[PDB]
Every structure is written in structure tokens, then in C-alpha cells.
Scaffold this active site. Structure first.
Site, short mmCIF file in Angstrom:
data_model
loop_
_atom_site.label_atom_id
_atom_site.label_comp_id
_atom_site.label_asym_id
_atom_site.label_seq_id
_atom_site.Cartn_x
_atom_site.Cartn_y
_atom_site.Cartn_z
CD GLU A 199 -0.01 -1.29 3.25
OE1 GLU A 199 0.19 -2.32 2.56
OE2 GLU A 199 0.00 -1.29 4.50
CG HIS B 71 -5.76 -5.89 1.24
ND1 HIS B 71 -6.36 -6.44 2.38
CD2 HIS B 71 -4.50 -5.52 1.55
CE1 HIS B 71 -5.43 -6.42 3.32
NE2 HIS B 71 -4.29 -5.86 2.87
CD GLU B 72 -2.11 -3.83 -1.10
OE1 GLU B 72 -1.71 -2.94 -0.31
OE2 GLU B 72 -2.00 -5.05 -0.86
CG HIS C 273 -3.52 -1.20 3.55
ND1 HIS C 273 -3.56 -1.26 4.94
CD2 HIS C 273 -3.14 -2.41 3.08
CE1 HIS C 273 -3.22 -2.50 5.26
NE2 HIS C 273 -2.93 -3.22 4.18
CD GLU D 76 -2.32 -5.75 6.64
OE1 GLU D 76 -3.22 -5.95 5.80
OE2 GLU D 76 -1.36 -4.98 6.44
CG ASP E 163 10.58 -9.56 7.06
OD1 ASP E 163 9.56 -8.85 6.89
OD2 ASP E 163 11.72 -9.19 6.77
CE1 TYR F 205 -1.51 -10.09 6.50
CE2 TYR F 205 -2.93 -8.87 5.01
CZ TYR F 205 -1.67 -9.17 5.48
OH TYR F 205 -0.56 -8.55 4.97
#
Ligand SMILES: O=C(O)c1ccc(CN2C[C@@H]3C[C@H]2CN3Cc2ccc(Oc3ccc(-c4ncco4)cc3)cc2)cc1
Ligand SMILES: [Yb+3]
Ligand SMILES: [Yb+3]
Ligand SMILES: [Zn+2]
Length: 607
Positions: free
Chosen positions: A268, A292-293, A296, A315, A372, A380
Site C-alpha cells: 500500500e 485491499h490496497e 489501506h 490488516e 518477517d 488479517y
């Protein structure tokens, strides 16, 4: 306190602005330049401050035209090295200064991927892209690498004249580089304050096509036409998102379609969403990633998580908004279908980690954890499940969407915790506190495993998927002849994907069943990345050797982690492909994205 950052916290000093002047060197694989930070002191008598850095070479630090003393501490693994700067004059509270740092990145910067011409579509020019979320901005430039600090930015990027630079900002012109006629300078402006994980850069042989009043699609020439068609619903999705979240404040909404090694489905980056070319299905079926993007631009970019422990705020609310956009375009039965599919993905993540694993908690403690490594579907889907549960408990979607818009309005331009969100939820729904006190908050927010309550989902669109999956699972050899291509005639691509996800949850199936599925359905011919990915996992987990070259090819010809990681893991778990999986990773490692290389290495237990 942000435990993922080694920099001075927001209570000591705050970066108000970054002015970045840099040059991209493809021969050396380095970004060199100056990061000029406008810093505001939050304390009386401030004499030093600390910034985050990771594999950066510092040349000098200049304040008020003079070089100042600085020191780099010992490296703290994935957090990098703290950089302490001695201020020439003590600062009073609210006083601001400009600190100009001359630096150079390492070719192994975890934020960047440097591509050779061979690794691109065009084959004539190299390519560079960044990925700062969560804590990789420190691997590009010295900063307070924490989402608890928001800043504006300006940038001037010098690149070879044949290439184009883009950033997560409004394009502010281009000129020949005065210092070098073989180069061009591209200028950028980001007037909306952002957390530094939102800083982004791409340099390559890029072309653009307009697809809406505030949207250009950017990619190498070979992908422009397919991308313009694939993402044609962008403006319609922006209009729905504005209706749900309030004004879109960013000016432009452009899309950049990256080379296949891009590690995520999307990122995003403000003004310039980055997307994987694996969305190019040819029928717009994977457009939920764009929804979704787009979402954001409100949940995450406007209202931001204060630390990575509260990432579910970003998320969960984004998936919630994304599912409403797709629901407005395709109907309420479709929103429920996607929501139920999401619950299934949550079941898979909880099963994979184990029900007591701390990474299955909604709010996590990342103190000595690489974000990460902790990354998964949990924030999510468990986040979405909580909000969907609350929507049902509180009176429905129209009522819950009123809260979402008020929540975005309340916390715009700020960085918040789970406690700030919960406090506002209670304030907004004060007349429904008796209902809110029935929620098992301790379990939902702080406990591992599946949530304590499962929401209510309409099954209309899911029924045909479950029925076909159950026919295959319960079939004996004497029933295989009953299957035929006509079984799929009334299924959408989304439904075919769900049929595969339901079947994969019960894998392995007997080898004869999988061979029959290919015989009658010809799943090997499907290009849609989601369907192909689930079909290949099903083949490998069901021990079909014929699928080994197909799975290896998919795992390596693209690098979206959602696909690459489980494909390599399934291939390492099948005795017939184990050695091939390990050797393929070893041969590709040096040309992979640095984060993807690290994670696949950990998954395969190959150091
Ligand atoms: O389909 C897809 O392939 C897809 C994939 C990606 C995207 C978007 N992204 C851009 C990139 C990945 C995601 C967020 N970015 C990286 C990142 C952010 C935070 C982080 O730190 C965590 C904090 C808490 C938890 C946590 N775990 C349990 C609870 O909380 C887990 C990680 C680690 C990595 C879109 C589509
Ligand atoms: Yb301008
Ligand atoms: Yb039978
Ligand atoms: Zn997201």
C-alpha cells in the site's frame, strides 16, 4: 515503546520531514546520497539522538554547515546498528533542526532487490525496487524506523537517463542531471505525513497507461496492456472506499506492476500501490488485492499501528473494508463467501503454527522476533473475524460501517494501539456496552489458536464447493468414472478456487483420484495463480511425481511468498522431490529477493 526500533522514541524527538537526494548506481548496486532529517525535540536540553541503520555506510553528518560526531553501535541482528549523533547545540522543547546524513547502501540491503536485464521482461535494462514494511527503511536510509513517527518527504533521485524512477509520492517533475548528462533527476513530494515503512522507490524501463481520472498503471512495456485491463475496476473501487472511509486525501492512486520476484501480493505505498504480476489472471478475478490496497489508504496509511505488535489494526480493518468493497460490487452473498473463505485460511494458519503458538495471538510481542518471520494470515483473518463478529453482535453492517468511518476520522494522521481502538469502540457503542462486555476480550486479543466464537456466514455460494469437494473425498475407485468436466460448468473461478482449498484441507487424496481430476478437469491448463497454486500443492501432497517439474517451475518463475514458500515446503516434504527442492533453492538463492531467500532457507533448513 517500539521494541523493533533502536532509535530515540517519539517521546524524545520526532522526525517532521525527510529531504532525500540520492543517486542509483546499478554497476555497484548502491543508493548514495543525503538524507536531510528535520527533527523536533520533545525534551528540554536535548544533546544527542539515536537513529536506526542496517548495513549502511555513513560518510558524514552535517548540522548548521559543520560536520558533527556520530557513532555506530554493535549490530543487533535483523534490527541493524544504532547510530548516535552528538548535537552541536543543546535543543529546547519543540525546537527543530536539520540533520544532513551522507550515506551509501549495501548491495545486500534487505529493503532492496537489484535485477539484472535478464531478470526483467524487456531484457535490455536493469531494475530496482524497494519493500520497507516492516523494518527495512533502516536498510535504505538512517531514520527513526518506527510507525509511531509520521513525517512528510521530498526527494530528488538521479538515475541513468534511459530509466524512470517512481516513489510513494506525487511526481514533481524531471530534468537532465546538471552534474551528469548521462543521467536524469526525478523529483517527488509527499505532503501527507506518513510512517517511514511507506517510503518506496522503483527504478526501471517503465511505461504508463491511464485507466481512470486519478490512476495510471505502470509496468515494463510487455505488461502494460494486460495490466490496464486487469485493474480497470480501480476507479469504481476508489469511489466505494471514499463512501465507506471518507475523503481519499492522497491525490493520485497509481498502480505499479512489479517483476515476478515481488515478495507480496501488494504493498500500500501511498500514491503508488505496488502489485505482483501474479494478479494478471486475464479476467479481473484477483481484483480483491486492489480493493485491499485501496482500503489501506484509510486503515494503515491514515490510521497507523503504533508498533508492530498492533499490526492486526492495519490488516484486520483493511480486510474488513476490502470485503465491503467487493460486497458492494458483487453482492452480500459474495462478501459472506469471501469472509468464510478467510475463516478457512485462518484454520490453515492455526493448524500450521499449532494452536498454542504465540504467532496465532492477535496482539503479539515482537521484542526479539523478526517481523518477517512472524508474518502470516493471522492478523488479517483473526483480525477480520473479530470485526465481523462485532458487526453481527452490534446490529449489522450499516451500523458497524458507521463506527469504521468515525474510527478513521478520529485517528487520521495518528499512530494507535489496540487499547486506543478498544477505548474508541466502547465510546462509540456506549449505548451497547452490555453487549461489548460479553466479548471474551482476553481470548480474542491475547490468546493463541482459533477465536472463541465463530461468526455466522451465509453459505449460498460456498455450498456447491463443499458438495463437490465432499464427492471427491468420499469417492472410491468405482466412483471416479462418475466425474466429468460438466461438474464445473456452474462454478465461478472463485468457486473453483474454494473447491480446491476445501479439498487441500483434507490432503492427501489417493493418487488415482488426483490423476482423474486432471483427466476430467484439466487443471494443469489453468493460469490463474491462486487456482494453479492450490492445484499443485494438492498434486505434490498427494505424491504425483508428474507435478514435480510444474511445482518447481511455479516456485521459481515467480517469487510471491504466499506461493513460493508453501510450494518449496511441499516439495521438500515429498521424498521424490526433496533433493530437487533443496538444490533448486541453492541455485536460485543469489538471484532471489533477500527477504524471500532468508525465509525459504529457514523453511527448508538450508543455511
Ligand atoms: O497475498 C499476498 O501475498 C499478500 C501479501 C502481503 C500483502 C501486504 N503486505 C506487505 C508486506 C507483507 C504485508 C505486510 N508487509 C510486511 C510485514 C509487515 C508487518 C510485519 O510484522 C508483523 C507484525 C505482527 C504480526 C502478527 N502476527 C499475529 C499477529 O500479529 C505479523 C507480522 C511483518 C512483515 C498483501 C498481499
Ligand atoms: Yb510542482
Ligand atoms: Yb462403490
Ligand atoms: Zn494489507
Amino acid at each position: 515503546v517500539d521494541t523493533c526500533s533502536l532509535a530515540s522514541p517519539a517521546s524524545v524527538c520526532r522526525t517532521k520531514h525527510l529531504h532525500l537526494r540520492c543517486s542509483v548506481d546499478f554497476t555497484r548496486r548502491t543508493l548514495t546520497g543525503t538524507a536531510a532529517l528535520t527533527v523536533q525535540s520533545q525534551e528540554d536540553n536535548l544533546r544527542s539522538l539515536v537513529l536506526d541503520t542496517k548495513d549502511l555506510t555513513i560518510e558524514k553528518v552535517v548540522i548548521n554547515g559543520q560536520e558533527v560526531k556520530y557513532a555506530l553501535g554493535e549490530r543487533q541482528s535483523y534490527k541493524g546498528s544504532p547510530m548516535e549523533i552528538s548535537l552541536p547545540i543543546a535543543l529546547s522543547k519543540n525546537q527543530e533542526i536539520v540533520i544532513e546524513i551522507s550515506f551509501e547502501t549495501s548491495p545486500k540491503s534487505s529493503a532492496l532487490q537489484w535485477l539484472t536485464p535478464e531478470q526483467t521482461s524487456g531484457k535490455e535494462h536493469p531494475y530496482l525496487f524497494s519493500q520497507c514494511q516492516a523494518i527495512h527503511c533502516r536498510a535504505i536510509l538512517p531514520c527513526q524506523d518506527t510507525p509511531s513517527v509520521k513525517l512528510t518527504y521530498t526527494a530528488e533521485v538521479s538515475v541513468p537517463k534511459e530509466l524512470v524512477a517512481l516513489m510513494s509520492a506525487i511526481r514533481d517533475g524531471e530534468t537532465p542531471d546538471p552534474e551528469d548528462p548521462s543521467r536524469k533527476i526525478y523529483k517527488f513530494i509527499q505532503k501527507v505525513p506518513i510512517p517511514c515503512y511507506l517510503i518506496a522507490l522503483v527504478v526501471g524501463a517503465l511505461e504508463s497507461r491511464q485507466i481512470g481520472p486519478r490512476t495510471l498503471v505502470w509496468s515494463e512495456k510487455e505488461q502494460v496492456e494486460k495490466s490496464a485491463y486487469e485493474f480497470s475496476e480501480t476507479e469504481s473501487m476508489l469511489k466505494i472506499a471514499e463512501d465507506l472511509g471518507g475523503p481519499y486525501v492522497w491525490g493520485q492512486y497509481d498502480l505499479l506492476v512489479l517483476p515476478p520476484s515481488f515478495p507480496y501480493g501488494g504493498m500500500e505505498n501511498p500514491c503508488l500501490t505496488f502489485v505482483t504480476p501474479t494478479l494478471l489472471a486475464g479476467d479481473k478475478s484477483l481484483s480483491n488485492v486492489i480493493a485491499h490496497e485501496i482500503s489501506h489508504s484509510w486503515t494503515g496509511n491514515l490510521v497507523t499501528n503504533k508498533t508492530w505488535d498492533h499490526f492486526w489494526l492495519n490488516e484486520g480493518h483493511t480486510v474488513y473494508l476490502e470485503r465491503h468493497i467487493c460486497g458492494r460490487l458483487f453482492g452480500e452473498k459474495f462478501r459472506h463467501f469471501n469472509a468464510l473463505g478467510g475463516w478457512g485460511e485462518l484454520q490453515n494458519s492455526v493448524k500450521t503454527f499449532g494452536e498454542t503458538h504465540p504467532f496465532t495471538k492477535l496482539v503479539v510481542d515482537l521484542t526479539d522476533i523478526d517481523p518477517d518471520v512472524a508474518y502470516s494470515s493471522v492478523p488479517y483473518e483473526k483480525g477480520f473475524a473479530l470485526l465481523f463478529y462485532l458487526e453481527q453482535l452490534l446490529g449489522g453492517p450499516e451500523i458497524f460501517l458507521g463506527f469504521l468511518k468515525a474510527y478513521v476520522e478520529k485517528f487520521s494522521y495518528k499512530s494507535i494501539t489496540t487499547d486506543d481502538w478498544k477505548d474508541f469502540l466502547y465510546s462509540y457503542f456506549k449505548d451497547k456496552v452490555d453487549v461489548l462486555n460479553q466479548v471474551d476480550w482476553n481470548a480474542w486479543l491475547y490468546s493463541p489458536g482459533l477465536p472463541p466464537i465463530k461468526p455466522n456466514y451465509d453459505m449460498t455460494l460456498t455450498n456447491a464447493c463443499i458438495a463437490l469437494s465432499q464427492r471427491w473425498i468420499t469417492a472410491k475407485e468405482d466412483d471416479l468414472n462418475s466425474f466429468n468436466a460438466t461438474d464445473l460448468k456452474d462454478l465461478s473461478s472463485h468457486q473453483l478456487n474454494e473447491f480446491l482449498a476445501q479439498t487441500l484441507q483434507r490432503a492427501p487424496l489417493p493418487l488415482g483420484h488426483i490423476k482423474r481430476m486432471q483427466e476430467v478437469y484439466n487443471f494443469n491448463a489453468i493460469n490463474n495463480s491462486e487456482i494453479r497454486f492450490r492445484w499443485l500443492r494438492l498434486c505434490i501432497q498427494s505424491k504425483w511425481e508428474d507435478a514435480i517439474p510444474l511445482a518447481l517451475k511455479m516456485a521459481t518463475e515467480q517469487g510471491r511468498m504466499k506461493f513460493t514458500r508453501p510450494l518449496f515446503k511441499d516439495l521438500a516434504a515429498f521424498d521424490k522431490s526433496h533433493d530437487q527442492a533443496v538444490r533448486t533453492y541453492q541455485e536460485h538463492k543469489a538471484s532471489m529477493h533477500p527477504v524471500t531467500a532468508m525465509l525459504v532457507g529457514k523453511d527448508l533448513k538450508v543455511d
